[PDB]
Amino acid sequence: QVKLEESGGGLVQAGGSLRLSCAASGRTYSTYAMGWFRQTPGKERELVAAINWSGGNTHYADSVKGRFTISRDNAKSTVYLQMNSLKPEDTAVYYCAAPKGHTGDHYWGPGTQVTVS
């Protein structure tokens, strides 16, 4: 099965920026769409941003539009989430995800803490 490897994140002051990365490990020109969900205590995971296999189509949650940008290094099967103008409400665990076929279910990375002070 596809393995998703995450890096980035950490603690940042409000107004600051972080850049998350997720790689479909060992894959070259992977055909998986990739993106991030985030989760806070007591709530379900919520889709933040996603990008298709080619990098030509993206999706953003309304709450992050104009602040977060998802991009893709297609050869390296790696996506990046540039998180600018961070707000306290952005504090969450961010999980990389790829679709399980066409089913609407997902493969998951391990999760990355983003904490905005």
Numbering used by the authors: 1 to 117
Publication passage describing the model:
VHH R419 has a melting temperate of 66 °C and was found to be a monomer in solution. The protein crystallized in space group P6522 and the structure was solved by molecular replacement to a resolution of 1.5 Å. Crystals from the robot screen diffracted to a resolution of 1.5 Å, and the structure was readily solved by molecular replacement. The structure contained a single molecule in the asymmetric unit, with no major disordered regions. The paratope of R419 is flat in shape, with a radius of 23 Å, which falls within the normal distribution of VHH paratope radii of 15–25 Å. CDR 1 is 13 amino acids long and falls within the 4th cluster. The CDR2 loop of R419 is 10 amino acids long, and falls within cluster 2, which is the most common canonical structure observed in camelid VHH. CDR3 is 11 amino acids long, which is within the range falls within the median loop range of 7–16 residues found within 86% of antibody structures. A percent recovery of 82% (± 2%) was calculated from four experiments. These results suggest that R419 displays superior biophysical properties in terms of reversible folding and aggregation resistance. However, a recent survey of 70 camel and llama VHH found that aggregation resistance and reversible folding were very rare, with only 1–5% of antibodies reversibly folding. Interestingly, R419 contains none of the factors correlated with the propensity of VHH to reversibly fold, such as an usually long CDR3 loop (see below), or the presence of a non-canonical disulfide bond. The structure presented here may be useful for homology modeling of similar VHH or given the protein’s high expression yield, mid-range thermal stability, reversible folding lacking in significant aggregation and ease of crystallization, R419 may be a valuable tool for CDR scaffolding or as the basis of a novel semi-synthetic phage display library for VHH discovery.
The variable domain of these Camelidae antibodies can be cloned, resulting in the smallest known functional antigen-binding unit—the VHH (also called nanobodies, single domain antibodies, or sdAb). VHH antibody fragments are small (13–15 kDa), heat stable, readily produced in E. coli and display distinct antigen-binding properties compared to traditional antibody fragments. The VHH R419 was originally isolated from a pre-immune phage display library to bind the Listeria surface antigen Internalin B. VHH R419 was later found to be non-functional as it was unable to bind InlB or inhibit Listeria invasion in vitro. Here we report the structure and biophysical characterization of VHH R419 for its potential future value in homology modeling of other more therapeutically relevant VHH.
